[PDB]
């Protein structure tokens, strides 16, 4: 069916009067009424509205095609605005905080044939790496609805591992993309920083300087040529983004390749070991030049990372929103980032800060000569829906053990692109193609994704 | 004569065989020994060798031109890691600390054929207004040596301005490029950020967010033109800079103008108002579209930058080295950044930086529709030599006023253009090159630069 | 010379034999007929006249001196009715109107021995800071005939800065003998209220209850003796004058100075702020107590009196006299006032006139714990000859901001002594005296007067 | 007999044993208890405070004088703050003001030895030539009390009067002490601008330019002598009074008079003619110079004082304190100001203000060659009560053109000393010693004061 197909295939199809996008969107909103009270992904979903916008679009064009997303249903984020939506967070005192204005992303992609199916579920702050929530409630895994669906974009990863939507948007401030993805088996692209506008109407969190060079806004997809369909839409730098930068994408015609095991300080297990060395084969195979060994020390990256966040989170962000935050998530920041709390001096603060240019000012000279690093997402396979729930310190910090692969990436502002075996690809900011033409690459040679099904 | 010569003027001289890169290098280190006892301006000249550099590539070359600044003298701040030249930083401990390597900046001029003159002098931290160093000294004002020559990079615009070399190189963190341009009456560029990549074989600040953000490498320059041609040389990216952004450079067709004057709370002199005006009159006779009364209310940005800085330089920078700096330069910054300290207390540093966001957003969309500004840099001539000089935290309030159109350039990034008559072109990054040619098209009518000689 | 000489040394000169009076006389009208086409400084001179009244003394008096002006030449403001010189008020339609009788200030200082040269230039109603007259043009002044001499009294101050009056004579509403006197580089003082009368043959203002407050009669000088004599002549009580109070003359021992910058609002240029820095310093070197951050908050007090001033010029004043004006000085008067314009309801105005009795309770109050107000009159050196032309709303507003600290000593009745700096000493009324002493005394620390050739 | 006595001849009791402060406070105080139900002159008193204050004294002092005022009971107006004391302004709304300090005024008088014995009853803004308060109510004349005890200080009048208080003082923006000292049948003095500092913790009125040109503060006396002395406290400037000028008082040797009649359109009725006419001859009999139909044309300053004062009264005053005033005062204001009130073009405020200085340069010139210019002040003994009520326009306008001697000495800011006769005298500022003078020469050949028992 159109569920389980590309968004060219979907487009097709259209072109060819086989179905209206009418029926694209409807067969989606059915679906999700089988399958989303399982998985609990979509939070707020736009069917009677969206089902307009099908109509008048099939009227209008008709076998024409739109835009490059004509036809293409999509999941948002709770986090990216959308107008007859809310900017819940996932906080019940922010029910009601309906939005008037579609953030700039939202706008390019619907723009260019939207498809809004509806709101994806987050975490309470969107700063958890389980998504649940006090107001929705709990994501699960459409693989096995037992496990955790991901890490703030988790529900996004939902709706497209349980083909509830072709395509979906989320945010990697601390691999709050990249992991969920792994996790649900989806695609996933961080965007580096300067790629993607971020312009929000009501925003999760300030417009701190961490985020402006950590966190990103980027697509989930199962497909490569899907990731790159969207990126390419989203894509482009806006003058009211000041983070926004009006330099073109690059790519290098001879990436020398890189395999980051243990220069991060993760637990890894030898199941992504193998799906990593596995990784490594097929671009070899690709005629890619991957190497091992040669990726100098970035052990203390994720933690200045869990520093800079964890500080800001614990003394300045929870005293306000732990108020209506789960004390799930409450007490998973004090026990997880309450370690590397630098404290309210910020000599501190600034001090982690600078470690940050000192590993980055190497990290950069690196990619000069390995321009792409393969690396283990998760470090664990799919955890239990109880990873998180007030487990205690040691227990927390084993965890971030073995999540240390994902925060460097957000750190050093570097684009991240997610594999559905959970293995990553990050290179050059800037280079976001490099990623997703070696990830065409690896599409066929590697396992094809399949729509998941809580049947 | 070569010391009054464009980089124009001397590599078709150069070409017509009428000079030698010698006789220019010879020229300039002849003047230096004449003025530099009163400017002070330069503090390590490299003479023989550079002398040399000009006989060889007078050899090799001959009438032809090896690029854009061969047989080009230059000043070259301090604070840049030239091959063999002190890095003091202005402070005496550091008085026998060699640069082995060229900063990237250093070799890629030099690479354009530019002749290293000589070191020039700075202030003991690079952070003041006036560039009074407890290793090398006071540098005065070419013009009078009664003034200022400005800080941070004061030495290179009075080398400018006094003929001792072509053009010059610095670093505007507060407006420590264009404010000793616009007081020694010469040209200076700060670059937007991204434009122009800092590798530092020693470094004259930490890798702070701060210098990140608002800190760049820019040019000095008696003609519009001969800044380009080092904008031009200096400008592209570098991988290891990670600040260095690969962008295009660009242009706007036909840019509207907005004039600044109290949006930023500054006093401003009649005659730097006066000069406001002329420029502005110049603008519109260039055919320029200048409105007025549009710029938003941005006077917490000055304000907002001296928090920054201010709780920076004081709880951290000067308990380091804050005992080797001269008694002038640490009280400066404690009477005038005193009063912006945030303290230590962490959650006040990051509620600034988001008032930084909520500014940076509101100017970013006013400057699609009026592109560039045209402000008063210091909004006061060069004052006396003293005026930094133990004055006190309710006098240093009241200087801080005065220069209160400077810091906000620095705040959001942008380049700033400063015109030798102190008036200053502001626009978006990456857009350096409209401010270049802005600044040529009024060139013919606004007053003319000429070298100065204090001795005669 | 003479020109060059103080009264002291002019009288010595008489009575040594040196000199006669005509020889003065004849000096100042030789100086006159050189620079005068260039300043325009006087509109009418009686040379023929007072050579004849010089002569007339040498018969009589000789060697002997009967006044304490005897043998001093003297300007005086067309404002001034002099006998067979006509009281034009600057313009074309009084060109013809001529003057029978001395105003009483014009007689007490003639009756002391002053010789009158001749009638000064002055601006359109007596109501502008740049005098540019219908009938007469535009006054220059002597230091740089590119520059404005200054505000109603300009001749006058133009006349003494280039040693074509000894001594000259004005009227103050505005800053109108402080403001020229501090462009020309002169001394100049405001008597309080009630200490000087005010009797007009053909007045230049309709002695409204605002100029019975705020408006006074005074002189100009290049010595603090000078402004001594010249006070004690003009200064005593008319019972025709009923503005004229009986009360004698008085001097504090010790008087305090406080230091008045941005009190009133003023916009200050950095020159003005370092001349005031000077002259505190000059002080607290003669002995005086100096404090800063002290005086009240006088920042509605600017604003009260352009309200008061500016209501009434522009619906009162301006509509009698508005075709036969420039309209250079009616443009001005609509620019800037045009702002303070409370418009005809009495209810506005009366409460107007409340907010000063207010502001003025409180300085009289604090002037017993600082009697004496050292504050810079104009915020600006001599601004350019076309400041007011046709500046506009915007322009002129920003102009008011930089001459805030004129208008409140005329507000409140209080006298001000304008040094040659652009310093001025502010007192209580009937504290004249005072201000004469401390003058007198930072005089021989501050820089001198000297007298000014434009021709040469 | 104290209630009935001169400064200095309760100074000579005082200091004889014959009598204690105390004494003659209490005296005051009892005399009030009776007489005061007729008048209802004193709107607040403080005799536990004053008798206090007398014993203290004559613990310390005893038979010594502390000061020219020691033993003195003392009368103030509503207008002026005593501390304790409240300041009503004759408006309800005020009862519950009390005043945490003395006025400079009465701060002086006290620390002259002088017992402020309470506080005066006054009209509702001190507004009115009737002594009628919403709180207090009306005040009765002690000689007939059928008759007003007119003007704004019509108390202070008609304690001293009474013999409730043997001095009082009072403030004049219109003929408001001249009028009741002339209606109560004693000496009234009202300074000239400058003399007596206007230091004023609750204001009564505006400090406009108005009350800075024509509004004073003086004494009520029964003799011509104890109004020196009070003059003599009261006088002097302050620096906190902008107003209040460092100038020395000043006399002549010779001076000449000149007789006001009609000068300023008044109507006389044929008894005040009279008494200006024996004033006129007891002013010759003491050997002065005096000078008839030789005033210029003053009648349109009367008019020029009304105009101002009016036009602001109706457009300022009245629409902030109308509805907390009596109908009667609010009404009085209204119709006899409203003929004058000039509206609110600044032009036409600013015309009569340009007009007041032409009229005020020929009376400054003309009071060189007549420095003293005798006149009456009402030119009406005093009416009965009810001749502001109510009585409309046409009717004001008489009233107006009566007492049109009174408000031009307040026009131009000049001093006025009203006999107990109902005669002033003006001079030029500054001058008040003239009036004293002239006053004490006559007061043997004019008719003698004698306290009132209703």
Avoid at 130 to 136: F, P, Q, R, V
Avoid at 237 to 258: I, K, Y
Wanted: proline share 8%.
């Amino acid at each position: 069916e159109p569920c389980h197909a590309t968004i060219a295939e979907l487009q097709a199809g259209i072109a060819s009067g086989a179905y209206s996008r009418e029926d694209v969107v409807a067969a989606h909103l059915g679906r999700t009424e089988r399958i989303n009270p399982v998985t609990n992904s979509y939070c707020e979903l736009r069917g009677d509205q969206v089902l307009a916008e099908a109509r008048a679009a099939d009227r209008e064009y008709g076998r024409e095609l739109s835009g490059p997303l004509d036809g293409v249903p999509m999941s948002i984020k709770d986090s990216f605005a959308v107008r007859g939506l809310r900017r819940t967070d996932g906080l019940p005192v922010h029910a009601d905080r309906v939005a008037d204005e579609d953030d700039e992303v939202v706008a390019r992609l619907r723009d260019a044939g939207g498809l809004v199916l509806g709101h994806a579920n987050v975490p309470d702050i969107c700063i958890r790496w389980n998504t649940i929530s006090g107001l929705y409630g709990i994501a699960r895994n459409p693989r096995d609805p037992s496990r955790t669906a991901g890490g703030s974009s988790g529900g996004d990863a939902a709706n497209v591992a349980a083909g509830m939507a072709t395509v979906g948007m989320g945010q990697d401030l601390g691999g709050s993309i990249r992991v969920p993805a792994s996790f649900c088996g989806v695609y996933g692209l961080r965007p580096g920083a300067g790629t993607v506008p971020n312009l929000s109407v009501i925003p999760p969190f300030p417009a701190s300087p961490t985020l402006d060079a950590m966190g990103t806004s980027g697509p989930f997809a199962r497909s490569a040529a899907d990731l790159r369909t969207m990126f390419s839409v989203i894509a482009g730098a806006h003058p009211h983004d000041p983070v926004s930068v009006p330099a073109p994408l690059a790519g290098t015609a001879s990436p020398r390749v890189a395999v980051l095991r243990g220069e991060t300080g993760a637990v890894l297990d030898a199941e992504i070991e193998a799906r990593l060395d596995a990784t490594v084969d097929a671009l070899r195979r690709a005629g890619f030049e991957v190497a091992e060994d040669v990726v100098p020390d970035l052990r203390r990256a994720p933690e200045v990372w869990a520093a800079i966040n964890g500080t800001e989170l614990i003394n300045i962000a929870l005293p306000e929103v732990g108020a209506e935050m789960t004390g799930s998530g409450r007490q998973h920041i004090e026990d997880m980032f309450g370690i590397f709390d630098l404290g309210l001096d910020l000599r501190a603060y600034h001090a982690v800060w600078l470690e940050r240019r000192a590993l980055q000012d190497a990290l950069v000279r690196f990619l000069e000569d390995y321009p792409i690093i393969v690396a283990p997402v998760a470090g664990m396979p799919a955890p239990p829906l109880d990873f998180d729930h007030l487990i205690g310190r040691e227990a927390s910090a084993r965890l971030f053990d073995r999540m240390r692969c994902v925060p460097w990436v957000n750190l050093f502002g570097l684009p991240g692109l997610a594999l559905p075996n959970g293995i990553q690809l990050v290179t050059r900011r800037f280079h976001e193609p490099d990623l997703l033409a070696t990830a065409e690459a690896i599409e066929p040679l590697l396992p094809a994704v399949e729509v998941a099904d809580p049947v």
